């Protein structure tokens, strides 16, 4: 059992002068992303989009344009610094969707509450020939 | 000394020596037997 931490607005954002690498209309009408982390101090870190920003001591909130930017920055926060991070997807309705770490456990560490998806129980060479799924909507790897 | 002979056995060096010898040979053959579209000795 794991309860995703809710996104807390009014969480401070890093010190940064602005860049052309930030959000666009996509964030207004489609979706954007938010990564939060806890920092032990004020540090300089490389922004996945602009140049250099100053991570604030304590909780940090950072809105990014793509999920991959959140995961890249988080990978670095966990690597260069030793910082726990989470990030979420945010729709223009205000709805928030917690994304990562999905279990509260990082996905490279096996966690027992996890259900198999897209797992085929056979060697890859035992997939059927296309002719055997022709005119059916299926793909030989969907089995 | 052993290491130097080893270096001289390496692919590019052995290749330059080998093809340089081959080139001198073919050059001298075309020097004593120039032109020649055929094997004239039959």
């Amino acid at each position: 059992g794991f309860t995703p931490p809710e996104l807390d607005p009014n969480t401070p954002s890093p010190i940064f002068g602005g860049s052309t690498g930030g959000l666009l209309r996509k964030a207004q009408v489609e979706e954007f992303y938010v990564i939060t982390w806890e920092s032990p101090k004020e540090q300089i870190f490389e922004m996945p989009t602009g140049g250099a920003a100053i991570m604030r001591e304590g909780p940090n909130l950072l809105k990014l344009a793509r999920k991959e930017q959140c995961l890249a920055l988080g990978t670095r926060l966990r690597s260069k610094y030793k910082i726990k991070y989470q990030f979420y997807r945010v729709f223009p309705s205000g709805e928030v969707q917690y994304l990562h770490p999905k279990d509260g456990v990082y996905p490279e560490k096996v966690n027992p509450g996890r259900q198999g998806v897209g797992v085929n129980f056979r060697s890859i060479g035992k997939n059927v020939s296309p002719i055997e799924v022709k005119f059916t909507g299926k793909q030989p790897y969907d089995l | 000394m052993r290491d130097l002979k080893t270096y001289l056995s390496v692919a590019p060096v052995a290749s330059t020596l080998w093809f340089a010898a081959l080139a001198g040979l073919l050059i001298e053959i075309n020097r004593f037997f120039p032109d020649a579209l055929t094997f004239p000795f039959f």
Binding site: - | T6, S9, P34, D35, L37, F39, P40, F42
Partner: protein, 154 residues
């Protein structure tokens, strides 16, 4: 003669080519003092030209209307010097090279690090093996019969 050609010894165009070449080199020769080294060089090229055309004429090469040798590769016994004989020589040398290289690869294949001798040549082994190519046709024929030439079930 063959293919409507004429022997180069009988070709007017062939002799016209020799003439125009020699007169060209002599036109270059008129510019230098006859004792000078450029002069001796152009004389050497002239003698080499005469040797060339005279040899092509002697050894029976047929000429086209262009006055240039054409080679008869059909196998006609009058022209084996134009392909079949140098061809057998080639196949002997190429078979030599490939047979020796194959001998080397077989010799180093069970070494502890085979690639090590492929980038740094074992020259003693190579020298031991180079003269196997002298008898490569007997060796390869005997291997073909014995079943050592081709890998089994590949």
């Amino acid at each position: 003669d063959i293919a409507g050609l004429t022997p180069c010894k009988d070709s007017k165009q062939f002799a016209k080519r020799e003439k125009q070449s020699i007169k060209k080199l002599e036109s270059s020769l008129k510019l230098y003092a006859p004792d000078s080294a450029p002069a001796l060089a152009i004389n050497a090229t002239i003698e080499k030209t005469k040797r060339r055309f005279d040899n092509y004429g002697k050894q029976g090469l047929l000429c086209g209307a262009d006055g240039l040798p054409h080679l008869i590769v059909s196998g006609d016994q009058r022209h084996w010097g134009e392909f079949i004989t140098p061809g057998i020589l080639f196949l002997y040398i190429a078979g030599w090279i490939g047979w020796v290289g194959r001998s080397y690869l077989i010799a180093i294949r069970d070494d502890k690090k085979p690639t090590q001798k492929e980038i740094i040549i074992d020259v003693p082994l190579a020298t031991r093996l180079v003269f196997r190519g002298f008898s490569w046709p007997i060796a390869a024929y005997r291997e073909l019969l014995n079943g050592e030439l081709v890998a089994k079930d590949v």
